[PDB]
């Protein structure tokens, strides 16, 4: 009989049971969304949005809830650290419960459509054979999709009727769900401009409505009908799979490179912010300012926010994890419980030295202290014999400013070495590792996991699109060639 | 007796028996899970 | 315990369910 990999073909020419299996799939996906939300709420710790944000805790769908406006819980806490006295129906658990109920209702509808498959609606009135007017159905669906896209862009994300979307400062310090005005100029195509999202959705929804009306009206030509096989549902499947992996590539690139729709307060920093010294540059500019204004070094480093200092730390890099390093970043390096302050290194001569920061590629990196002019002045040698740049030989001390070690100066090499090795990773923090039994190895961010899953799905769906386009074009030779 | 085994029998399990077995398994799990998790 | 009870419950569900499903599916294929 059928091979195991062809069982689902039994609904190719059964529109009612195709609707039924679609409804079952939708029920499963909605139920997954609800159950995943409830899992993440059960395991989420909201007591420290600064040093333990959701992207340090392995939260995957919690950022997607927070992105569109759901920011309060029924547990009395807001995602921004405030107090929610009236979260309303649409809390995190409220959205979870709504998805569970939706899953159940879709399961019932799937049962009904499986039983009552033989609807005269699916019969062609001319010949009595089962058929689908796929151009007309596409017109209806495109019209509905355009209406929904326009409504989402004109009422939800603008704050006209909905709550808006999550918008933050460039350095991820003061983000919140805000209404967003559309940007109708060239800046509307700025990926990092939040105003591009409402403008895109309004314009694309209007275009989708107009094109849906066109596809409702105008029948396809015979040439293009036969060329694209518009009478076969597998042709629609191949083109749909093509569009879906195109979108998967787009969202994977957008999540990996960052955009206005992937905030760092929800998904974590990007690897390019570490590579290009984004937070390091901002921190050093904020320290250079108020030094020219006339503050000492002990202050104006205490003025630096711990959130920004935490952002400038390679352990929050999404490209420092592993394929089988599972779970939260907290399970990787502990829960961050305090910024120790900036570490300034000096030698016996008094010149200032800086630890060469670890690049993203390197699992391990040698500890190197470089002066202002780019000359290596100290290191932790691998060969502690005939060495010329060890911490002991150079006489390097370290002074901390702004954190829990503010004002303290360490001169013993055994501690200068460990603080330089920690400064290799960026800003130095203290981590509680006993709570989760962290193994001391870096994990990946939710944006990294999202990008990996969606790029893998995008390639597999490229193969699926190839297979189904092949099946559509070469249907008449699917069981073999004509032999004549 | 012969080259094939003559004691060939076909095993049958109708849908009512499947439902009874599934109910037995899940009800035993419901009853005993509170004790297994303690 | 939290996880050994979890795997015990999962196995006690799945293995007899697998046995029953094998027998039912062969029977239903035999109508």
């Amino acid at each position: 009989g059928l091979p195991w990999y062809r069982v689902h073909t039994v609904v190719i020419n059964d529109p009612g049971r195709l609707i039924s299996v679609h409804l079952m799939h939708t029920a499963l996906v909605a139920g997954w969304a609800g159950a995943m939300t409830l899992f993440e709420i059960a395991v989420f710790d909201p007591s420290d949005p600064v040093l333990n944000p959701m992207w340090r805790q392995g939260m995957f769908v919690l950022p997607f809830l927070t992105r569109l406006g759901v920011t309060q819980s029924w547990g009395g806490w807001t995602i921004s650290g405030e107090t929610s006295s009236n979260p309303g129906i649409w809390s995190y658990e409220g959205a979870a419960a709504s998805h569970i109920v939706l899953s159940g209702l879709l399961f019932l509808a799937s049962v009904w459509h499986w039983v009552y498959w033989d609807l005269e609606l699916f019969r062609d009135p001319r010949t009595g054979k089962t058929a689908l007017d796929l151009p007309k159905i596409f017109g209806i669906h495109l019209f509905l999709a355009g209406l929904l896209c326009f409504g989402f862009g004109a009422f939800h994300v603008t704050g006209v009727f909905g709550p808006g979307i999550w918008v933050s400062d460039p350095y991820g310090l003061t983000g919140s769900v805000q209404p967003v005005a559309p940007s109708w100029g060239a800046e509307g195509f700025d990926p990092y401009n939040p105003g591009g999202v409402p403008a895109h959705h309004i314009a694309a929804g209007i275009l989708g409505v107009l094109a849906g009306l066109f596809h409702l009206c105008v029948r396809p030509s015979i040439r293009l009908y036969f060329g694209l096989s518009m009478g076969s549902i597998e042709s629609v499947l191949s083109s749909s799979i093509a569009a879906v992996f195109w979108a998967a590539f787009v969202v994977a690139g957008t999540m990996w490179y960052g955009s206005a729709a992937t905030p760092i307060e929800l998904f974590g920093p990007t690897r390019y912010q570490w590579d290009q010294g984004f937070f390091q540059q901002e921190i050093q500019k904020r320290v250079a300012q108020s030094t020219s204004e006339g503050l000492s070094v002990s202050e104006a480093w205490a003025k630096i926010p711990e959130k920004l200092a935490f952002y400038d730390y390679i352990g929050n890099n999404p490209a420092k994890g592993g394929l089988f390093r599972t779970g939260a970043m907290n399970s990787g390096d502990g829960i961050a419980v305090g910024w120790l302050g900036h570490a300034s290194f000096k030698d016996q001569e008094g010149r200032e030295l800086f630890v060469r920061r670890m690049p993203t590629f390197f699992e391990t990196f040698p500890v190197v202290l470089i002066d202002k002019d780019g000359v290596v002045r100290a290191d932790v040698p691998f060969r502690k014999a005939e060495s010329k740049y060890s911490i002991e030989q150079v006489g390097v001390s370290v002074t901390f400013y702004g954190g829990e070690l503010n004002g303290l100066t360490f001169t013993d090499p055994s501690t200068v070495k460990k603080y330089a090795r920690k400064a290799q990773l960026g800003e130095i923090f203290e981590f509680d590792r006993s709570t989760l039994q962290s193994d001391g190895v870096f994990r990946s961010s939710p944006r990294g996991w999202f990008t990996f899953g969606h790029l893998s799905f995008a390639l597999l769906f490229f193969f699926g699109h190839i297979w189904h386009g092949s099946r559509t074009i070469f249907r008449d030779v699917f069981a073999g060639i004509d032999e004549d | 007796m012969a080259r094939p085994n003559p004691n060939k029998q076909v095993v049958e399990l109708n849908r009512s028996s499947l439902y009874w077995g599934l109910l037995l398994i899940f009800v035993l799990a419901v009853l005993f899970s509170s004790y297994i998790f303690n | 315990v939290n996880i050994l009870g979890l795997t015990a419950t999962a196995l006690f569900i799945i293995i007899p369910t697998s046995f029953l499903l094998i027998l039912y599916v062969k029977t239903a294929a035999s109508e």
């Binding site: - | 109910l23 899940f26 899970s33 | -």
Partner: peptide
């Protein structure tokens, strides 16, 4: 975690009940 298991077992039992009611083998008058 354990509440998840208890709720799953209860809803699985209810699903078995639903299927045994509405998708039973129909008794045949023959």
């Amino acid at each position: 975690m354990e509440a998840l298991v208890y709720t799953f077992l209860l809803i699985g039992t209810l699903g078995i009940i639903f299927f045994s009611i509405f998708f039973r083998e129909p008794p045949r008058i023959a």
